[PDB]
Copies of this chain bind each other. A is one copy, B any other.
Amino acid sequence: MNYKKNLLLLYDRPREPIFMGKGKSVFDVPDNYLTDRYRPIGPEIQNRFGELAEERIPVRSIALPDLRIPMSLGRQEQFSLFIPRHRKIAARLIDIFMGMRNIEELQSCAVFARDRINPYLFNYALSVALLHRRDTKNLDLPSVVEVFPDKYVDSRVFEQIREEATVVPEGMRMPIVIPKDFTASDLDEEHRLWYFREDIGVNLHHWHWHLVYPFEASNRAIVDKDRRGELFYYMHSQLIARYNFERFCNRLQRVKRLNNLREPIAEGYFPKLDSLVASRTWPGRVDNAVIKDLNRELDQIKQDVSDLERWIDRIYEAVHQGYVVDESGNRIFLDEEKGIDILGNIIESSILSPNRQLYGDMHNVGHVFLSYTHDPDHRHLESFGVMGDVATAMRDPVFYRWHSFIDDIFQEHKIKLPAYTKSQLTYEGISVTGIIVQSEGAPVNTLHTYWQQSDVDLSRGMDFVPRGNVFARFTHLQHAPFQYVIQIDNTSDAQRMGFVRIFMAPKNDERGQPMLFRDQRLFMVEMDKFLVALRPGANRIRRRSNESTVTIPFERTFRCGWPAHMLVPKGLPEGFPADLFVMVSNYEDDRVVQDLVGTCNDYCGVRDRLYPDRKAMGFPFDRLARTGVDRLSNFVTPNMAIQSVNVIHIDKTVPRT
Q: Which residues of A are at the interface with B, using a C-beta cutoff of 8 A? A: 101, 133-135, 218-221, 326, 328-333, 338, 354, 588, 591, 593-595
7 interchain pairs, CB-CB under 8 A: A101-B593, A133-B593, A134-B594, A135-B594, A329-B330, A329-B332, A329-B333
Q: Which residue of B lies closest to A338 (CB)?
A: B328
Taking a contact as CB atoms under 8 Å apart, the answer to whether A332 and B338 are in contact is no
Between A101, A218, A326, A591, the greatest number of chain B beta carbons within 10 A of the residue's beta carbon is seen for A101
Contact in complex: B593, A219 (CB < 8 Å):
yes
Residue of B nearest to A325 (CB): B330
Q: Give 14 A-B pairs besides A133-B593, A330-B332 with Cβ atoms closer than 8 angstroms.
A: A101-B588, A101-B591, A101-B593, A134-B593, A135-B593, A135-B594, A219-B593, A219-B595, A221-B594, A326-B330, A328-B331, A328-B332, A328-B338, A330-B354
Closest-CB distance, A329 to chain B (whole angstroms): 5
Closest residue of chain B to A220 (Cβ to Cβ) is: B593
Report how far A326 CA is from B331 CA in the complex, Å: 9
Q: Which residues of B contact A134 (CB under 8 A)?
A: 593-594
Nearest B residue to A224 by beta-carbon distance? B609
Q: Which residue of B lies closest to A333 (CB)?
A: B329
State whether A331 touches B329 (Cβ < 8 A).
Answer: yes
**Which residues of the other chain, B, contact A332 by a CB distance below 8 angstroms?**
328-330
CB closest residue in chain B, given A589 = B101
User: Smallest Cβ distance from A273 to chain B, in angstroms?
Assistant: 38
7 closest cross-chain pairs (CB), A and B: A329-B332, A221-B595, A219-B593, A134-B593, A101-B588, A134-B594, A329-B330
User: What DSSP secondary structure best describes chain A's contact surface?
Assistant: loop
CB-defined contacts of A333 to chain B, threshold 8 Å: 329
Counting chain B CB atoms within 10 Å of each CB, the highest count among A326, A591, A593 belongs to A593
> What's the minimum C-beta distance from A325 to chain B, rounded to whole angstroms?
8
Bound together, the chains give a CA A326 to CA B342 distance in angstroms of 15
**Distance between Cα atoms of A326 and B593 in the complex (Å):** 22
> Which residues on the B side are within 8 Å of A101 (C-beta)?
588, 591, 593
Q: Which residue of B lies closest to A222 (CB)?
A: B595
Give complex CA distance A133, B332 in Å: 26
Q: Which residues of B contact A338 (CB under 8 A)?
A: 328
Alpha-carbon gap, A332 to B135, bound state (A) = 30
Closest to A592 in B: B134
Q: Give A106 Cβ to nearest chain B Cβ, in Å.
A: 10
Give the complex CA separation of A218 and B332 in angstroms. Answer: 15
Which B residue's beta carbon lies closest to that of A221?
B595
Complex Cα–Cα for A328 and B323 (A): 12
| Distance, CA A221 to CA B609, complexed state (A) | 10
Measured in the bound complex, the distance between the Cα atoms of B331 and A273 in whole Å is 46
Question: How far apart sit A332 and B330, CA to CA, in the bound complex (Å)?
Answer: 7
Q: Roughly how many angstroms separate A513 CA and B338 CA in the complex, as a whole number?
A: 59
* Minimal beta-carbon separation of A203 from chain B (angstroms): 32
Report how far A133 CA is from B593 CA in the complex, Å: 9
Closest Cβ–Cβ distance, residue A470 to chain B (whole Å)? 38
Closest CB-CB distance, A230 to chain B, in whole Å? Answer: 15
Cα(A182)–Cα(B563), bound, Å: 75
Instruction: Report how far A635 CA is from B588 CA in the complex, Å.
Output: 59
State in angstroms the CA–CA spacing of A221 and B101 once bound together. Answer: 28
Residues of B within 8 Å of A326, CB to CB, are: 330-331
The CA of A594 and the CA of B103, in the complex, are separated in Å by 11
Query: CA separation between A133 and B594, bound complex, in Å?
Result: 9
Q: How far is the CA of A476 from the CA of B384 in the complex (A)?
A: 73
Contacts of A221 in B (CB 8 A): 594-595
CA distance A484 to B99 in the complex (A): 32
Chain B residue at minimum C-beta to C-beta distance from A332:
B329
| Cβ of A154 to closest chain B Cβ, rounded Å | 43
| Residue in A135, A218, A328, A330 whose Cβ sees the most chain B Cβ within 10 Å | A328
Chain B nearest CB from A173 CB (Å) reads 44
User: Which B residues lie within 8 Å of A329 (CB)?
Assistant: 330-333
**Complex alpha-carbon distance, A101 and B590, angstroms:** 10
Residue in chain B with minimal CB distance to A218: B593
Chain B residues whose CB sits within 8 angstroms of the CB of A331 once the complex forms = 326, 328-330
| CB nearest neighbor in B for A591 | B101
Nearest CB of B to A112, in Å: 18
* Residues of the B chain whose Cβ atoms lie less than 8 Å from the Cβ of A135: 593-594
Q: How far is the CB of A214 from chain B (nearest CB, A)?
A: 16
A513 → chain B closest CB, angstroms: 44
Shortest CB-to-CB span from A92 to chain B, Å, is 14
Enumerate chain B residues within 8 angstroms of A591, measured Cβ to Cβ.
101
Closest B residue to A608 by beta carbon equals: B221
> A334 to chain B: closest CB distance in Å?
11
Bound-state CA distance A331–B330 (Å) is 9
Provide the bound-state CA to CA distance between A359 and B221, in Å.
29
Closest Cβ of chain B to A451, distance in Å, is 47
Residue of A134, A330, A331 contacting most chain B CB atoms (<10 Å): A330
Question: Separation in Å of the A380 CB from the closest CB of chain B?
Answer: 41
* Residue numbers in B under 8 Å from A595 (CB-CB): 219, 221
Chain B residues within 8 Å of A219, by CB: 593, 595
CB distance from A353 to the nearest CB of B (A): 11
Determine how close the nearest CB of chain B comes to the CB of A588; give it in whole angstroms. Answer: 6
C-alpha spacing A134/B220, complex, angstroms: 22
List B contacts of A218 (CB < 8 A): 593
Contact residues in B for A354 (Cβ distance below 8 Å): 330
Distance of A607 from chain B, by nearest CB (Å)? 15
A257 to B135, CA, bound (A): 46
> Which residues on B sit within 8 Å (CB–CB) of A133?
593
Which residue of B is nearest A103, CB measured?
A: B593
State the CA gap A338–B331 with chains docked (Å): 16
